[PDB]
């Protein structure tokens, strides 16, 4: 690949043109969730825009947040996700899912997907931070148990990497 400059390039300019065409809270919510499932976390579907996705994500958040304040009633801003769900209900649901996880690999996927789907502006900040914090407490207690137990050879097979080179 030949990268363009860092802060101003054709990838970012094109995505800003798409984002400017979002006109409703429902449309913007779908857009940002798809974007975050597609392009963020180690389970993203594509690394194609790896060096630009974080800036682009900020611009989608900006559009969704303004649409929220122009189109939703004030009480919705405090108590609902933009999916229409009850914010407190999203909280109780995902804390329940992670406390039922059996492995670190199940727990890790729940926490990552929760953030992919509900990161602000989808969920209210206060509700989101508190849930994210409770999910992380669980994830860490699972992962940090017997941290040095599995040898690297086993961890590599559990994780699912393709080992391309190991120096001798």
């Amino acid at each position: 690949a030949k990268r363009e400059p860092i802060h101003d390039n054709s990838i970012r300019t094109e995505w800003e043109a798409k984002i400017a065409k979002l006109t409703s809270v429902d449309q913007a919510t779908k857009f940002i969730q798809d974007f975050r499932l597609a392009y963020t976390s180690p389970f993203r579907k594509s690394y194609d825009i790896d060096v630009d996705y974080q800036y682009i994500e900020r611009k989608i958040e900006e559009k969704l947040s303004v649409l929220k304040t122009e189109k939703l009633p004030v009480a919705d801003l405090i108590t609902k996700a933009t999916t229409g769900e009850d914010a407190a209900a999203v909280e109780a649901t995902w804390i329940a899912k992670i406390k039922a996880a059996k492995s670190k690999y199940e727990a890790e996927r729940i926490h990552i997907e929760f953030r992919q789907l509900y990161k602000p502006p989808v969920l209210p900040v206060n509700v989101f931070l508190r849930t994210d914090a409770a999910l992380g407490t669980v994830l860490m207690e699972i992962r940090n148990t017997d941290y040095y137990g599995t040898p690297l050879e086993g961890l590599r097979k559990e994780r699912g990497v393709k080992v391309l080179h190991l120096q001798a």
Binding site: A1, K2, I6, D50, I112, D132, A134, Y148, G160, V161
Partner: protein
């Protein structure tokens, strides 16, 4: 009554107020930390320094007045700002501005610890640290501000908060002294920041450096850094109080040694090679071999007096120590190869070791001359210093098979074909992305915790771009718009410009494309 009373003169001393502090907190069901953590800090922890807000200010203002008198009055009248050996005045661009981000991020880390603790006294120790790290941010800034005004090369002293972003060394500093302080379990952050970063590595970085500074003509840095560390010692006590406060929590038996070993490796991975590099290669006059400095401060004194003594409470000698000792001997020489080879991406001017430096290196690290010194002397002959040479050594490494990789976890560069310090290359593909890892401890961190470690590296960001365009876009030039801040020599003539770099034709590759 209204006619009699005792009229002896009395006031109220700070320790009289401090004794009531524990009772300022009060009980309610929502009264708990907002931050994720595996541990529970005990409600009854006391602090070692009895400080209240008024006495805090009194004590710190008295330090400042003496420090700013020495700087603005005495050392300015003596002309001390331009009496520094050029190699050292360049090294201080990097030391003071890189340390600055650690001071800055320690503000936020200490505040996260103040949130975590339940005992008012313990919150108060962290709170004093929060204010101190603001002091230190401004103090590191003041050093580079003073050098900008008084030293013969202000470029890079005057703009590092933006020009540090060009180069690879800055990424590793953000891991140990920025993200490592604030991103994680509050207790993992505490061990990274206080028990290891502050109680272990600031002794070399902030205290021991002052002797190197003075040897090279710099009395500005001792004036400030020795004052900085007067506060730092109270932060060492904060790190220890963290451990005290979780000592009776069963989670510590489960988790604390894992968090400690991860933090110890995190900190040493960067500071062991980078301080040894800045001390030995960024000085003319040397105080002692870096491996002796590390032995005294890190292995024998911190290791024996902090970790060794905590043995009776379940703290183990860190499992990664043996690997760390090999790095202390060789890894700063490995890093020098990468730092000198990629000199145009930095913001300071460098000097190859001279004939008497080389003799000292070989005497204190037998074998240096046949491995590192042969390479530096070849580069010198090829025109390393000469802007008409067309020669940039990063290209020479690639031509001879000596690829540079970036560790996905620590961001420290690694040259497996030349390195004598700890580590070995692992290249994985995961979900369509290739990753290079360089040691056993950080490979495990990434395998278990891949969503913590997604940091773009300079080859990913600059792939296929020509060096001089990256330097120009990053503002890595002097006020004429064309002479680089960075230079491969410390002389006052024959400085490299953007067009001298462009003539070498150096384009960033993707190092993992061959795998």
């Amino acid at each position: 009554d209204a006619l009699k009373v005792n009229r002896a003169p009395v006031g109220v001393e700070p320790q009289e107020v401090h004794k009531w502090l524990q009772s300022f907190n009060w009980d309610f069901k929502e009264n708990r930390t907002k931050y994720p953590t595996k541990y529970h800090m005990a409600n009854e922890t006391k602090e070692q320094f009895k400080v209240i807000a008024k006495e805090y200010a009194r004590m710190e203002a008295a330090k400042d007045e003496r420090q700013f008198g020495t700087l603005l009055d005495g050392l300015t009248r003596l002309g001390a700002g331009n009496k520094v050996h050029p190699r050292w005045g360049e090294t201080m661009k990097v030391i003071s501005n890189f340390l600055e981000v650690g001071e800055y991020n320690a503000i936020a880390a200490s505040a996260m610890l103040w949130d975590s603790a339940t005992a008012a006294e313990q919150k108060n120790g962290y709170l004093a640290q929060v204010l101190d790290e603001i002091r230190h941010t401004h103090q590191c800034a003041f050093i580079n501000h003073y050098y900008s005004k008084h030293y013969h090369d202000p470029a890079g002293h005057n703009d590092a908060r933006r020009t540090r972003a060009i180069g690879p060394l800055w990424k590793g500093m953000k891991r140990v002294f920025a993200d490592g302080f604030i991103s994680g379990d509050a207790v993992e952050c505490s061990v990274n920041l206080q028990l290891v970063g502050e109680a272990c590595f600031t002794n070399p970085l902030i205290v021991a450096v002052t002797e190197w500074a003075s040897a090279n003509g710099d009395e500005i840095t001792p004036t400030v850094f020795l004052s900085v560390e007067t506060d730092e010692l109270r932060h060492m006590a904060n790190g220890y109080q963290t451990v005290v406060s979780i000592a009776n929590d069963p989670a510590s038996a489960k988790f604390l040694n894992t968090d400690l070993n991860n933090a110890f490796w995190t900190q040493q991975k960067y500071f062991t090679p980078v301080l040894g590099y800045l001390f030995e290669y960024g000085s003319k006059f040397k105080v002692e071999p870096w491996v002796k400095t590390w032995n005294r401060w890190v292995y024998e004194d911190w290791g024996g007096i902090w970790i060794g003594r905590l043995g009776k409470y379940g703290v183990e000698s860190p499992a990664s120590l043996r690997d760390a000792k090999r790095d202390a001997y060789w890894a700063h020489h490995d890093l020098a190869l990468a730092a000198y080879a990629m000199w145009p991406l930095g913001f300071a001017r460098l000097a190859l070791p001279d004939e008497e430096d080389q003799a000292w290196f070989e005497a204190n690290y037998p074998g240096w001359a046949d491995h590192y010194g042969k390479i530096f002397n070849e580069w010198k002959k090829l025109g390393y210093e000469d802007p008409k040479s067309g020669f940039i050594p990063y290209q020479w490494l690639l031509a001879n098979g000596h690829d540079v990789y970036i560790d996905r976890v620590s961001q420290v560069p690694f040259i497996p074909s030349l390195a004598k310090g700890t580590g070995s290359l692992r290249v994985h593909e995961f979900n369509g992305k290739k990753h290079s890892l360089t040691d056993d401890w950080g490979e495990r961190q990434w395998l278990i915790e891949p969503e913590r470690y997604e940091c773009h590296n300079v080859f990913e960001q600059y792939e296929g771009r020509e060096l001089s365009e990256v330097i120009a876009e990053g503002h890595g030039v002097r006020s004429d718009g064309k002479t680089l801040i960075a230079q491969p020599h410390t002389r006052g003539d024959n400085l490299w410009t953007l067009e001298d770099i462009k003539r070498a034709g150096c384009v960033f590759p993707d190092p993992l494309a061959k795998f």
